[PDB]
Amino acid sequence: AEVLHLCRSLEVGTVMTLFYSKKSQRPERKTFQVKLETRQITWSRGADKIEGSIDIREIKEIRPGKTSRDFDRYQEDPAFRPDQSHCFVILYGMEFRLKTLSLQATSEDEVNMWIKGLTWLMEDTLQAATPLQIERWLRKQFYSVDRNREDRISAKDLKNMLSQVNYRVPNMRFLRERLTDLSGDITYGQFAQLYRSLMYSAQKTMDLPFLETNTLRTGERPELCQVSLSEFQQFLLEYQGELWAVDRLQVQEFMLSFLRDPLREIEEPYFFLDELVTFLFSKENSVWNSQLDAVCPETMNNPLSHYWISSSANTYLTGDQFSSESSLEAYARCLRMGCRCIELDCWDGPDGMPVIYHGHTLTTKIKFSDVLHTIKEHAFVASEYPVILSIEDHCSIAQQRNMAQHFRKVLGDTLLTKPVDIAADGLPSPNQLKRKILIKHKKLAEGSAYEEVPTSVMYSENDISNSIKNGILYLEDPVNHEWYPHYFVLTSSKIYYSEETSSDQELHSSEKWFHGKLGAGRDGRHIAERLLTEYCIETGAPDGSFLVRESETFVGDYTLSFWRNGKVQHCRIHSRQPKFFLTDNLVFDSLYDLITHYQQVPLRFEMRLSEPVPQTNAHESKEWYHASLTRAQAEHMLMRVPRDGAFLVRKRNEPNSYAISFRAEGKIKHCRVQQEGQTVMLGNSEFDSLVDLISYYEKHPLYRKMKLRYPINEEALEKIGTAEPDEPEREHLDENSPLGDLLRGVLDVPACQIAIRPEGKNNRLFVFSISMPSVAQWSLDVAADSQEELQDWVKKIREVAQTADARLTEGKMMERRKKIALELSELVVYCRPVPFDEEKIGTERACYRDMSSFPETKAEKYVNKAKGKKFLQYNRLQLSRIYPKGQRLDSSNYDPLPMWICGSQLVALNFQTPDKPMQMNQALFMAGGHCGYVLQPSTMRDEAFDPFDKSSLRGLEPCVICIEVLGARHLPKNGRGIVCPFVEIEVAGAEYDSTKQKTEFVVDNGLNPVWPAKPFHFQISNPEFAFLRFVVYEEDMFSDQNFLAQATFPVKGLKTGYRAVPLKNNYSEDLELASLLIKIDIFPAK
């Protein structure tokens, strides 16, 4: 069909030029291909050596051109200059930040072919059929663990692969023994057949009212008995309630659509029992009614003040508000996900063009024309409804004319200049503002010059902006004395220092086969087999094994040994300064390559060595070890140190059990790790060696967010810099602080005296240590990286000591600020901020155009029993923007449900933060396919509704919902251990409906678990506004609740009967094959 030809042609491959993301790597030439078996894009180092490839499913957008970071980085040097019609970039990822791949071709036709083929492949693979998706998943999981396509995987490989997909295998020789190698141990067909057999057998305990009633359960393992068409014809009418099942033709079409098989297409379609059970979970059985995913033009004709428009704040950023970078990719992603309100913060630019960055903060600056271009490029790709640009300006006034001119010229007709209806008493409906962009700014008053009227912004409370001077200075480490970075802010009379912030953007010895020292002469000869012969008893070396290490009889050489025909030969490697070579063998530049070379050529005198062997006695030599150690001493050393995170390992009396003692929140915790032969485990998780365990946990969390960081030994305590030795000011809480939760201490400048230290500081040279003469034994040494900064900080601090506070009021009342320009202020026609007056609510003196802004703090004083009712009448006619308080330096969001129910529309969030409010915001907009606009229910638009009074609901029909979860399938992994999942259900809404109920937790099963029956009853008084949320938590060995997957749905558009619930991730991105099965019943008016 003129497309398969294109796909197969693309399968051939082509030679592209890759521009690496990292600056160090030079642009290079590679070979690219598309694999249609698993729908992958694969590039190879050479002709057929693949380097990792990517999945077509994750492709989020394809853009032709060179607008990417790598090209701009390399655009300077005139050696790899790109061309506007010979390069493109691929965007992929499942997070807010999208990874990019920058490619260059040789001709335009080649690029056109590639882009068209990839677009079509992505479109086809997106909406596939469940059996096809399962087949592709099997193919990927099989080949990925198969370096070649020979389709050969051993028993150990199958066991490990099963262990890697959240399913333990305690049944030795589990289930079946079809062949058991009685060359390919498990072919693809055998793999798929066994997969379906297991997925059916392990999930047979769930009892259904119709599946097992068809004279089934006789005992046949394959259960060839196929469900007839008529039984489905009746069932779909009985339980599911699909009226479409009345006609046989529609049912038959459904059968064919789900099946997608030609051989069975021509004879009375049927389902086998396994296929039926799999169909239960399929998206075709999804509880969410896909019919609602469209956008109804009827529900887009109300005044704009009613819709719960999306929003975001601090878009240019991509992380914490203090040191995160700024990029246009954030703007693109936010506009794509379905946002309609974004904020711009402008500052004076060196060349007359502003730069967008956070005021008085270490935020990387970006240009303005580039931001405008990105806005124009990604404005109406995901919708056709207006977007509002709120501008925060701090620039000059000539910069204001420049901004206005650039905006007009670039945006052309898309920018508003006239109002749709001057005489209209309400904001025009969204349909009237299709393909438009609104501009929001402080606006100029009816007078002249800078003017807002009150100017009395009396908040003026501590923050990153209203400070004497901020910056990043290092602090010493009492244990090992490393100058980690910290955040310093100089306030009027106090300073604040935060917790460490690490947030940012040999080979032969480390080799597994490298055993290190073994003995001295004869011991090495005999000990060599002592660590191998006793090891191979586990499984047995296939065609022998090998071991190599430093040679004993030959100093400066390595001895090579290998088991062969009941003999362990001894060899030597001649290391001559540098081309290492064996006896009468080709030279090799390194030992690592010397051994590897033998593993490629088929040395089968030529011996080919098998897989290497891991080592065990590697933890003993390390410092963090104690052969003998009792509890009391354990916690004594653990509490001796002043920092939290210290860890150590100790022996335990019963064999093969060790303990890890660590510190957290000023408390001791002990974790028991068991050992068995060639395995270790603190729980369901499995690790090869204790050294491997610590290394994995040295860079990954173990308990809560703590990370093993300080290895503790008597020497470390002896060299301890200071731990409250010989009253300090560590302090706690102090919530009302500039640094929100990041605060770690406080100090008062007036009582401090400053003395510079132009002396031999440890590896530092810019020090202005602070001393406390009032209380002896205090020295707050602070380092820096330049001479000028040290002087600037010191001078500012000294002024504080003799400041002699004389400011008129708290944080000043502001003064001549920007001299607002006419050009920039002329554009705004809607959404012009003004002060908030309570008396105007409900009167004839309030205009619909004006809005107001709340930093969640003056807002939390309106969402209450006394003010909720009055505040509700305000959002009916006017808008109201709510943004997070300045104290939140982690970008943490806030629960907006009270704000939404109260009627506020533009509830801005922080998209970069994957937290519960963001998930709720994403879920709420499902009604419309993320079009960005959702209409308010009819109940909230009545004169008697009250957000905090059940009886006020009047004549709304209540609802009673009965839920019973049967089981899960394909739960994602978390860390290394096997998840012990429990699914908790929650109803969210008003304060008088919110509730949560949790089930029990299954042990060591996450691939297909089923829970004991326990019907759940829920009651809702306001079905129109509610949210049903399933969260699959895991019960770790520390009795804590971690996050695996979530699924939130509005209650309005839900089906009945037996249903499947697809899962997602914390970022609201669909998972693959993960879902739940439930029985749901609704009893309206009962």
Q: By the criterion CB under 5 A, which residues form the site for Ca ion? A: 345, 392
- DSSP labels for 409-455? HHHGGGB--S-S-SS-SSPPPGGGG-S-EEEE-----SSSSS--S--
CB of 357 to Ca ion, least distance (A): 11
Residue (392 or 1004) nearer to Ca ion, CB: 392
In order of 59, 74, 318, 913, the CA distances from 505 in angstroms are 23, 19, 10, 16
CB 211, CB 231: distance < 8 Å: no
181 marked among binding-site residues:
no
Instruction: Supply 1084's token pair.
Output: 């309206």
What 122-128 contacts at long range (C-beta under 8 Å, 24+ apart), as own/partner pairs, is 122/56, 122/57, 122/59, 122/62, 125/39, 125/56, 125/57, 126/57
With a CB cutoff of 8 Å and minimum separation 6, the contacts of 367 are 353, 355, 356
Nearer to Ca ion, 345 or 552 (CB): 345
Most distant pair of Cα atoms in the chain: their distance: 102
In 3D space, the residue among 897, 885, 826 whose CA is nearest the CA of residue 853 turns out to be 885
Q: Cα angle vertex 752, ends 746, 756, to 5°?
A: 110
Kindly tell me which of 322 and 580 has the beta carbon lying closer to Ca ion: 322
Distance of closest approach, residue 743 Cβ to Ca ion, in angstroms: 22
Minimum CB distance to Ca ion smaller for 344 or for 528: 344
Q: Hey, CA dihedral for 617, 619, 621, 627, is it positive or negative?
A: negative
Residue number, 223 or 392, with CB nearest to Ca ion: 392
Only one residue has tokens 């690496």, namely 20
When the beta carbons of 235 and 322 are compared against Ca ion, the nearer one is 322
Q: Which residue lies nearer to Ca ion by CB, 318 or 615?
A: 318
Contact 317, 359 (CB under 8 A): no
Smallest distance from Ca ion to CB 359, Å: 8
Tell which residue, 1032, 889, 895, 1017, has the closest CA to residue 962.
1017
Minimum Å gap between C-beta 332 and Ca ion is 19
**What Rg value do the Cα atoms of the chain yield, rounded?**
34
Query: What minimum distance in Å lies between the beta carbon of 346 and Ca ion?
Result: 10
Q: How far is the CB of 452 from Ca ion (least distance, A)?
A: 17
Torsion of CA 690, 691, 693, 699, to 10 degrees: 160
Alpha carbon distance 61, 83 (integer Å) = 20
CB 306 within 8 A of CB 430: no
- What's the Cα-to-Cα distance from 890 to each of 27, 323, 503, 645, rounded to whole Å? 36, 11, 11, 22
CB of 392 to Ca ion, least distance (A): 5
DSSP three-state, residue 704: coil
Q: Return the percent helix, strand and coil in the chain, to nearest 5.
A: 25, 20, 55
Instruction: Please state the closest distance from residue 879 (CB atom) to Ca ion, in A.
Output: 18
Residue among 343, 348, 313 at smallest CA distance from 818: 348
Closer to Ca ion by Cβ: residue 174 or 459: 459
> 714: annotated binding-site residue?
no
CB nearer Ca ion, residue 361 or residue 685: 361
In the bound state with Ca ion, the residue whose beta carbon lies nearer, of 312 and 551, is: 312
The least CB distance from residue 465 to Ca ion, in Å, is 10
Least CB distance from residue 345 to Ca ion, whole Å? 5
Closest CA to 372 of 339, 328, 341, 338: 328
For residues 345 and 1034, which CB has a smaller minimum distance to Ca ion in the complex?
Answer: 345
Q: Is 550 annotated as a binding residue?
A: no
Q: Does residue 392 have a known ligand-binding role?
A: yes
860, 908 contact by CB (below 8 A) = no
Q: Kind and range of the H or E element at 15?
A: strand 14-19
- Nearest residue (CB) to Ca ion, 745 versus 855: 855
Closest by CA position to 899, among listed 877, 868, 853, 935? 868
Q: What residues does 968 pair with on adjacent strands?
A: 1076
- Could you tell me the smallest distance in angstroms from the CB atom of residue 388 to Ca ion? 15
3-state secondary structure 454-519: CCCCCCCCCCCCCCCEEEEEEECCCCCCCCEEEEEEECCCEEEEECCCCCCCCHHHHCCCCCCCCC
The encoded tokens of residue 731 equal 């302090």
CB of 400 to Ca ion, least distance (A): 17
Please state the residue numbers annotated as binding site: 314, 343, 345, 392
Annotated binding-site positions for Ca(2+): 314, 343, 345, 392
